[PDB]
Ligand binder design. Sequence first.
Ligand SMILES: *[C@@H]1O[C@H](CO)[C@@H](O[C@@H]2O[C@H](CO)[C@@H](O[C@@H]3O[C@H](CO[C@H]4O[C@H](CO)[C@@H](O)[C@H](O[C@H]5O[C@H](CO)[C@@H](O)[C@H](O)[C@@H]5O)[C@@H]4O)[C@@H](O)[C@H](O[C@H]4O[C@H](CO)[C@@H](O)[C@H](O)[C@@H]4O[C@H]4O[C@H](CO)[C@@H](O)[C@H](O)[C@@H]4O[C@H]4O[C@H](CO)[C@@H](O)[C@H](O)[C@@H]4O)[C@@H]3O)[C@H](O)[C@H]2NC(C)=O)[C@H](O)[C@H]1NC(C)=O
Ligand SMILES: *[C@@H]1O[C@H](CO)[C@@H](O[C@@H]2O[C@H](CO)[C@@H](O[C@@H]3O[C@H](CO[C@H]4O[C@H](CO)[C@@H](O)[C@H](O)[C@@H]4O)[C@@H](O)[C@H](O[C@H]4O[C@H](CO)[C@@H](O)[C@H](O)[C@@H]4O[C@H]4O[C@H](CO)[C@@H](O)[C@H](O)[C@@H]4O)[C@@H]3O)[C@H](O)[C@H]2NC(C)=O)[C@H](O)[C@H]1NC(C)=O
Ligand SMILES: *[C@@H]1O[C@H](CO)[C@@H](O[C@@H]2O[C@H](CO)[C@@H](O)[C@H](O)[C@H]2NC(C)=O)[C@H](O)[C@H]1NC(C)=O
Ligand SMILES: *[C@@H]1O[C@H](CO)[C@@H](O[C@@H]2O[C@H](CO)[C@@H](O)[C@H](O)[C@H]2NC(C)=O)[C@H](O)[C@H]1NC(C)=O
Ligand SMILES: *[C@@H]1O[C@H](CO)[C@@H](O[C@@H]2O[C@H](CO)[C@@H](O)[C@H](O)[C@H]2NC(C)=O)[C@H](O)[C@H]1NC(C)=O
Ligand SMILES: *[C@@H]1O[C@H](CO)[C@@H](O[C@@H]2O[C@H](CO)[C@@H](O)[C@H](O)[C@H]2NC(C)=O)[C@H](O)[C@H]1NC(C)=O
Ligand SMILES: *[C@@H]1O[C@H](CO)[C@@H](O[C@@H]2O[C@H](CO)[C@@H](O)[C@H](O)[C@H]2NC(C)=O)[C@H](O)[C@H]1NC(C)=O
Ligand SMILES: *[C@@H]1O[C@H](CO)[C@@H](O[C@@H]2O[C@H](CO)[C@@H](O)[C@H](O)[C@H]2NC(C)=O)[C@H](O)[C@H]1NC(C)=O
Ligand SMILES: *[C@@H]1O[C@H](CO)[C@@H](O[C@@H]2O[C@H](CO)[C@@H](O)[C@H](O)[C@H]2NC(C)=O)[C@H](O)[C@H]1NC(C)=O
Ligand SMILES: *[C@@H]1O[C@H](CO)[C@@H](O[C@@H]2O[C@H](CO)[C@@H](O)[C@H](O)[C@H]2NC(C)=O)[C@H](O)[C@H]1NC(C)=O
Ligand SMILES: *[C@@H]1O[C@H](CO)[C@@H](O[C@@H]2O[C@H](CO)[C@@H](O)[C@H](O)[C@H]2NC(C)=O)[C@H](O)[C@H]1NC(C)=O
Ligand SMILES: *[C@@H]1O[C@H](CO)[C@@H](O[C@@H]2O[C@H](CO)[C@@H](O)[C@H](O)[C@H]2NC(C)=O)[C@H](O)[C@H]1NC(C)=O
Ligand SMILES: *[C@@H]1O[C@H](CO)[C@@H](O[C@@H]2O[C@H](CO)[C@@H](O)[C@H](O)[C@H]2NC(C)=O)[C@H](O)[C@H]1NC(C)=O
Ligand SMILES: *[C@@H]1O[C@H](CO)[C@@H](O)[C@H](O)[C@H]1NC(C)=O
Ligand SMILES: *[C@@H]1O[C@H](CO)[C@@H](O)[C@H](O)[C@H]1NC(C)=O
Ligand SMILES: *[C@@H]1O[C@H](CO)[C@@H](O)[C@H](O)[C@H]1NC(C)=O
Ligand SMILES: *[C@@H]1O[C@H](CO)[C@@H](O)[C@H](O)[C@H]1NC(C)=O
Ligand SMILES: *[C@@H]1O[C@H](CO)[C@@H](O)[C@H](O)[C@H]1NC(C)=O
Ligand SMILES: *[C@@H]1O[C@H](CO)[C@@H](O)[C@H](O)[C@H]1NC(C)=O
Ligand SMILES: *[C@@H]1O[C@H](CO)[C@@H](O)[C@H](O)[C@H]1NC(C)=O
Ligand SMILES: *[C@@H]1O[C@H](CO)[C@@H](O)[C@H](O)[C@H]1NC(C)=O
Ligand SMILES: *[C@@H]1O[C@H](CO)[C@@H](O)[C@H](O)[C@H]1NC(C)=O
Ligand SMILES: *[C@@H]1O[C@H](CO)[C@@H](O)[C@H](O)[C@H]1NC(C)=O
Ligand SMILES: *[C@@H]1O[C@H](CO)[C@@H](O)[C@H](O)[C@H]1NC(C)=O
Lengths: 136, 136, 136, 472, 53
Amino acid sequence: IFGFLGAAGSTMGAASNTLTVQARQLLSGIVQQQSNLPHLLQLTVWGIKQLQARVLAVERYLEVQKFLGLWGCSGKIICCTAVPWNSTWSNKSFEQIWNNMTWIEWEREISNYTSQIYDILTESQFQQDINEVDLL
Amino acid sequence: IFGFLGAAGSTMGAASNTLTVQARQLLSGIVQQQSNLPHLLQLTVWGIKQLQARVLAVERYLEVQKFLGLWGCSGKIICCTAVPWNSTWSNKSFEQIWNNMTWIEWEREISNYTSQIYDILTESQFQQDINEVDLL
Amino acid sequence: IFGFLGAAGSTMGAASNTLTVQARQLLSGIVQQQSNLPHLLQLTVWGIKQLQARVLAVERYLEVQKFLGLWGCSGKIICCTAVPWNSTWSNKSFEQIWNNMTWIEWEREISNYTSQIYDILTESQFQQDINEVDLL
Amino acid sequence: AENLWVTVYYGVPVWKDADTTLFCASDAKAHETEAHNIWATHACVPTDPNPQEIYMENVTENFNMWKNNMVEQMQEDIISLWDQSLKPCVKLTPLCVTLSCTNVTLTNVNYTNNFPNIGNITDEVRNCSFNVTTEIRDKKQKVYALFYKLDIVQMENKNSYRLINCNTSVCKQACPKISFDPIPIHYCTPAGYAILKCNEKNFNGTGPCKNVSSVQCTHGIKPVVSTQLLLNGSLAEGEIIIRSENLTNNAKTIIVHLNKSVEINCTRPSNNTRTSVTIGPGQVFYRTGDIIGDIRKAYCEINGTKWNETLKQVVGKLKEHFPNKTISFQPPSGGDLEITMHHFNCRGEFFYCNTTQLFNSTWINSTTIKEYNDTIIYLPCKIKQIINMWQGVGQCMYAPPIRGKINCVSNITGILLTRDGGDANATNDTETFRPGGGNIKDNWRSELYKYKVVQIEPLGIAPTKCKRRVVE
Amino acid sequence: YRLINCNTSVCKQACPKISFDPIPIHYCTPAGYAILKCNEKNFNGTGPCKNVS
Ligand SMILES: *[C@@H]1O[C@H](CO)[C@@H](O[C@@H]2O[C@H](CO)[C@@H](O[C@@H]3O[C@H](CO[C@H]4O[C@H](CO)[C@@H](O)[C@H](O[C@H]5O[C@H](CO)[C@@H](O)[C@H](O)[C@@H]5O)[C@@H]4O)[C@@H](O)[C@H](O[C@H]4O[C@H](CO)[C@@H](O)[C@H](O)[C@@H]4O[C@H]4O[C@H](CO)[C@@H](O)[C@H](O)[C@@H]4O[C@H]4O[C@H](CO)[C@@H](O)[C@H](O)[C@@H]4O)[C@@H]3O)[C@H](O)[C@H]2NC(C)=O)[C@H](O)[C@H]1NC(C)=O
Ligand SMILES: *[C@@H]1O[C@H](CO)[C@@H](O[C@@H]2O[C@H](CO)[C@@H](O[C@@H]3O[C@H](CO[C@H]4O[C@H](CO)[C@@H](O)[C@H](O)[C@@H]4O)[C@@H](O)[C@H](O[C@H]4O[C@H](CO)[C@@H](O)[C@H](O)[C@@H]4O[C@H]4O[C@H](CO)[C@@H](O)[C@H](O)[C@@H]4O)[C@@H]3O)[C@H](O)[C@H]2NC(C)=O)[C@H](O)[C@H]1NC(C)=O
Ligand SMILES: *[C@@H]1O[C@H](CO)[C@@H](O[C@@H]2O[C@H](CO)[C@@H](O)[C@H](O)[C@H]2NC(C)=O)[C@H](O)[C@H]1NC(C)=O
Ligand SMILES: *[C@@H]1O[C@H](CO)[C@@H](O[C@@H]2O[C@H](CO)[C@@H](O)[C@H](O)[C@H]2NC(C)=O)[C@H](O)[C@H]1NC(C)=O
Ligand SMILES: *[C@@H]1O[C@H](CO)[C@@H](O[C@@H]2O[C@H](CO)[C@@H](O)[C@H](O)[C@H]2NC(C)=O)[C@H](O)[C@H]1NC(C)=O
Ligand SMILES: *[C@@H]1O[C@H](CO)[C@@H](O[C@@H]2O[C@H](CO)[C@@H](O)[C@H](O)[C@H]2NC(C)=O)[C@H](O)[C@H]1NC(C)=O
Ligand SMILES: *[C@@H]1O[C@H](CO)[C@@H](O[C@@H]2O[C@H](CO)[C@@H](O)[C@H](O)[C@H]2NC(C)=O)[C@H](O)[C@H]1NC(C)=O
Ligand SMILES: *[C@@H]1O[C@H](CO)[C@@H](O[C@@H]2O[C@H](CO)[C@@H](O)[C@H](O)[C@H]2NC(C)=O)[C@H](O)[C@H]1NC(C)=O
Ligand SMILES: *[C@@H]1O[C@H](CO)[C@@H](O[C@@H]2O[C@H](CO)[C@@H](O)[C@H](O)[C@H]2NC(C)=O)[C@H](O)[C@H]1NC(C)=O
Ligand SMILES: *[C@@H]1O[C@H](CO)[C@@H](O[C@@H]2O[C@H](CO)[C@@H](O)[C@H](O)[C@H]2NC(C)=O)[C@H](O)[C@H]1NC(C)=O
Ligand SMILES: *[C@@H]1O[C@H](CO)[C@@H](O[C@@H]2O[C@H](CO)[C@@H](O)[C@H](O)[C@H]2NC(C)=O)[C@H](O)[C@H]1NC(C)=O
Ligand SMILES: *[C@@H]1O[C@H](CO)[C@@H](O[C@@H]2O[C@H](CO)[C@@H](O)[C@H](O)[C@H]2NC(C)=O)[C@H](O)[C@H]1NC(C)=O
Ligand SMILES: *[C@@H]1O[C@H](CO)[C@@H](O[C@@H]2O[C@H](CO)[C@@H](O)[C@H](O)[C@H]2NC(C)=O)[C@H](O)[C@H]1NC(C)=O
Ligand SMILES: *[C@@H]1O[C@H](CO)[C@@H](O)[C@H](O)[C@H]1NC(C)=O
Ligand SMILES: *[C@@H]1O[C@H](CO)[C@@H](O)[C@H](O)[C@H]1NC(C)=O
Ligand SMILES: *[C@@H]1O[C@H](CO)[C@@H](O)[C@H](O)[C@H]1NC(C)=O
Ligand SMILES: *[C@@H]1O[C@H](CO)[C@@H](O)[C@H](O)[C@H]1NC(C)=O
Ligand SMILES: *[C@@H]1O[C@H](CO)[C@@H](O)[C@H](O)[C@H]1NC(C)=O
Ligand SMILES: *[C@@H]1O[C@H](CO)[C@@H](O)[C@H](O)[C@H]1NC(C)=O
Ligand SMILES: *[C@@H]1O[C@H](CO)[C@@H](O)[C@H](O)[C@H]1NC(C)=O
Ligand SMILES: *[C@@H]1O[C@H](CO)[C@@H](O)[C@H](O)[C@H]1NC(C)=O
Ligand SMILES: *[C@@H]1O[C@H](CO)[C@@H](O)[C@H](O)[C@H]1NC(C)=O
Ligand SMILES: *[C@@H]1O[C@H](CO)[C@@H](O)[C@H](O)[C@H]1NC(C)=O
Ligand SMILES: *[C@@H]1O[C@H](CO)[C@@H](O)[C@H](O)[C@H]1NC(C)=O
């Protein structure tokens, strides 16, 4: 087993058995504690650098939870989608991705197209909801 | 293809084919940027309006996501439900709704009962879980 | 028929029928209003307690929504999982659990193990999602 | 039918009228001059290089000028920024004591390039000597300074003066290295709100607009402050537009918004040198040492024919709302110096121009077209240093002199009129409009009249024939 | 004589009840961020580090 980010160097297929380790630490921190001991203690130099740390944690977490909701992957860690891979984003074979690259190397390779894959994934889920409305 | 609120004047039939354009923009904003250049700049007049415009953006997103969680529609754009229309809320036909109204007029006719439709929606989802715990 | 926290004294069997009553009120509050009338009103002593009351409410809601996302119980009130209670956490019979125990007493006598049930419930869902990837 | 079930749609295009906390976004290309502007500070977030405006087609929305909340937020922001820019730096409490002024004697150039030939700054400034304290408390020094006659009041013992603010407040010197340049400011909404903009070119204040469009935030708005004529504005599209909350209520100001600018060209030909004394520990007070070279009153020149045609068009528009009366302009009838005279700013110097040749005339019936020759109107202007911009809410300020010659080239995109009340016994078919009037808010209603802030309600409920698959 | 500072500014007196003792301070990130630390002992200023933790 590994700690937070502990499998950052392992390959894509082997570092995917530790997704829950980096997914359990997106809101949990030390910042929620009040202080060592509690004028206007909320306007101290470190009373504002802690107020904006609480807000940064919320927006960072809600930034990906918004995409999971649109794509239909709410409440799931690994989510299968009905969007075919056109291989123009990357035409590497199965064994050259899951057994040869790294999650950092892979995400830098298709960083060009992630702005478009997000649009395709969102629109594909919308088409699924239209289909079931005129089906049930 | 339309932009933000671009089909607000179109009828409910044709304004419901562009729900994703008004859904991609409930958290994304310019406010996540830092500044033109980085005393106590987190207290400037322009630096307090930017703090409360980040909390407003977060809160306005959760008050619509909170309802989706209770009704069992999390992760879905169009969500069917087992709550029957009694026509006391609105006794119009199917054609007179989806071919003769825009979304703004429709939300003004049933503005009386949305406080009650929400409670009926919540109870139905709760009754789905009780009927499923004591059945499996 | 009950109010907020109205079933805190009832037995667990009869206090699980009012789950929605305590669930509708994890974001809703008086704080979201602006003021009696709109110097520097945004940094009054009570203009700061309202700012930190809004953040506390948002964070409190997101501490339970974070777990439900990992456990796979997003969009549900009573979510039935696949983790077997091994009776080491509690060996009390099914009758004694739901028929003279209250929700407060139950949480206390398993309070030693909630830190371990939470990690087990996350691992079972992750193992579910891996099994579907190499099955579909 | 009997097969209708509630279906939730997420993202539907609905909104409700609401009020939010607009933040500021300004372009960084104009900034990075290290000038430390007052309004459009570096704190404003960078703007989107390609803003989006979506044409909403079939929707008519009830816009309501004179009740827009966007204006009051701008007012509070302007006041707060003005106050916080004056906070850090030097006060003027040890300065104003019993002065002693005598008529100034100057050595100067003779011809002075007498093309306008308006006047000479003598009998406007006084060369007053007074005792201040140096960096050491137990040492007083006698120093001289040139003060315009509008900054000093004459107490008893007529050969002894005092500053105009001592017995009412304490003023802080305009702070030496900041700028008063109005840099455009965009007012952007949080994520969850939108701004509806009415695109009708001939659109009065309030009413249902039929050509609404949606934006994320407004165009550039300059916080320029003026009293009688709107400066550096945005031109009307269709024609001259006359807007007022109610045209039959003379207590309500009238805003005449033009569709063709009339440039006004202002200059201070004098040569003021800036000297610095020390009134305390690390506190430096700037003053005018001498006036050497050219000596002439500051003045503003205007093309006579352009302004004359502009008044013709404004009167043509005004005759429609007042059908059977002649329209006659008259100069302001009284009030403060900020009302009776067109007040504005250049490079830190605060100008008060007379503007009485622009604003009186009569238009009886347009019986015949009268042809004249090209003329240039020369408006005399005074200059003030002790500036109380906002009567009782803004901090009083002392603007230091600016070395060199001051020259501004600005546009006149609007006029602020105020109808004179009428009587019942006898109205000789005449109406007189006098310029000025209104508060500072009317300088920003002229920009924020197109915009309304709305809150998006993306949760819709409608019946459908689909039923949720109940699990067995 | 005169005080050294009497032409530049005015100095508030160091204030009796406060202490100048430096207590160690830990700079911690919010949730969603992390701090990479280069464990190489013979590490100069810039460049790649090979046992980042
Ligand atoms: C690099 O690291 C080096 C190692 O850390 C560092 O050197 C260290 O520097 C610190 C500087 O703070 C030293 O700590 C001080 O040590 C003082 C020594 O006191 C001697 O004399 C006392 C008699 O006056 C003896 O009692 C004392 O013996 C006992 O002292 C302790 C009780 O005070 C006890 O716990 C010990 O176990 C020991 O048995 C010793 O022989 C010490 O006087 C001083 O105490 C202050 O700080 C304490 C907290 O650390 C407070 O608890 C204590 O009350 C003192 O605070 C007062 O003074 C502060 C400074 O003015 C104020 O802020 C406080 O509010 C408080 O002032 C109140 O009380 C006043 C009356 O006393 C009153 O007049 C005021 O108005 C106010 O009301 C402190 O502990 C440390 O000893 C150094 N290390 C070594 C090995 O010597 C070095 O500096 C570092 N390098 C650099 C560049 O910084
Ligand atoms: C209606 O709209 C018009 C058009 O925008 C507007 O006119 C313009 O006003 C601005 C603001 O005053 C003018 O900008 C200033 O112009 C002077 C003129 O300098 C001439 O000579 C220099 C050579 O020395 C030329 O390079 C220059 O182009 C001019 O021909 C400048 O001297 C001013 O410079 C200051 O601001 C710069 C901003 O980046 C600084 O970089 C520069 O160092 C100067 O700053 C100094 O003063 C600051 C305080 O003000 C201080 O903080 C600094 O430390 C430093 O000491 C400035 O560029 C512009 O020329 C006008 N344009 C025209 C065509 O007239 C009207 O003002 C407006 N109406 C109203 C009522 O506002
Ligand atoms: C870093 O790379 C080395 C070399 O590839 C990895 O070591 C191998 O790991 C696999 C995975 O189980 C073993 O089958 C091999 O026996 C290991 N040794 C060699 C020489 O290949 C190492 O696991 C990588 N680091 C991490 C954290 O996975
Ligand atoms: C509080 O406790 C009393 C027991 O003293 C509960 O009263 C019992 O309620 C059950 C179920 O309604 C009945 O079957 C018993 O006959 C009742 N006993 C008595 C003595 O009244 C009461 O319901 C509890 N209240 C709440 C809100 O849980
Ligand atoms: C029903 O609940 C009661 C109390 O909540 C349990 O009875 C208690 O038993 C303990 C001994 O273990 C006694 O000290 C208490 O005095 C009893 N309570 C009362 C009110 O007399 C009982 O065990 C529960 N039912 C079952 C089947 O266990
Ligand atoms: C709604 O407002 C838009 C604003 O762009 C109008 O578009 C302009 O209309 C004028 C008047 O004919 C044209 O001269 C311009 O070429 C149009 N485009 C632009 C960019 O200005 C539009 O006409 C208005 N009315 C309708 C029905 O759309
Ligand atoms: C500005 O608006 C005025 C309206 O007050 C326009 O004046 C009209 O111009 C047309 C030109 O075709 C004439 O036929 C009208 O008689 C004029 N009206 C009046 C009352 O004189 C003027 O053209 C507009 N200018 C611009 C540049 O838009
Ligand atoms: C604004 O005023 C300045 C000076 O008052 C103008 O510059 C002068 O214009 C006159 C016009 O006949 C020329 O003769 C001079 O040679 C110009 N320069 C100087 C130094 O006097 C300037 O042109 C005016 N701007 C506008 C737009 O009218
Ligand atoms: C304002 O008055 C003072 C004193 O009355 C003038 O200061 C003197 O001016 C004369 C001019 O001939 C100089 O010779 C002296 O050296 C100056 N100082 C003193 C202490 O006498 C000052 O020049 C006057 N200012 C103006 C603009 O006339
Ligand atoms: C003041 O404005 C008038 C316009 O009313 C200008 O007169 C025009 O000048 C241009 C260029 O010299 C000619 O082509 C026009 O025929 C003139 N008349 C009209 C009615 O446009 C005059 O030039 C302006 N004054 C200055 C100094 O520029
Ligand atoms: C602006 O200038 C006009 C003159 O162009 C001033 O009007 C004169 O005011 C004096 C003051 O009592 C009268 O005696 C004159 O009869 C007025 N008319 C003329 C033609 O001189 C006017 O006062 C000036 N504005 C201000 C605020 O003083
Ligand atoms: C003053 O007004 C003139 C004319 O109205 C402006 O000159 C034009 O401004 C527009 C802005 O929409 C530009 O697109 C043009 O390129 C400018 N020149 C011409 C010949 O049309 C001038 O910009 C205005 N001054 C200020 C400071 O706004
Ligand atoms: C990277 O740094 C780590 C530091 O934890 C090294 O691991 C330690 O190295 C030291 C010195 O060689 C040993 O004394 C320790 O026993 C090692 N382990 C621990 C837990 O401290 C690691 O060796 C470094 N990387 C490489 C490739 O040597
Ligand atoms: C792959 O890319 C091509 C062109 O970029 C596009 O036509 C195709 O739709 C893409 N694949 C999918 C599944 O959209
Ligand atoms: C994958 O794409 C690259 C770039 O277009 C191309 O050079 C390569 O031949 C492709 N691989 C295959 C197997 O077609
Ligand atoms: C329709 O609304 C009325 C309003 O009181 C309610 O009583 C009724 O139960 C609703 N219809 C159904 C089928 O429940
Ligand atoms: C039962 O759960 C407890 C939790 O502490 C654990 O210690 C024990 O090993 C578990 N037993 C089995 C058989 O999993
Ligand atoms: C100063 O102004 C007066 C007022 O008309 C004028 O007579 C005189 O020539 C001007 N110049 C001097 C040096 O007095
Ligand atoms: C300044 O003080 C000196 C000596 O104290 C005195 O002679 C002179 O008249 C004073 N000047 C004033 C009060 O303007
Ligand atoms: C504005 O004009 C429209 C028609 O052009 C009219 O219906 C409306 O009442 C007017 N509003 C005002 C305030 O005059
Ligand atoms: C204006 O004042 C400066 C200050 O020294 C001087 O150098 C300059 O020559 C003066 N202007 C003229 C035209 O002499
Ligand atoms: C302005 O136009 C009117 C037209 O009645 C004329 O009487 C007046 O002399 C004109 N003004 C100038 C300065 O030419
Ligand atoms: C405009 O100025 C005065 C202002 O009252 C007015 O009486 C006069 O008739 C007009 N013309 C001149 C030249 O004063
Ligand atoms: C540090 O040392 C390594 C290896 O000696 C070298 O590659 C790197 O450039 C050095 N960095 C600097 C800043 O000298």
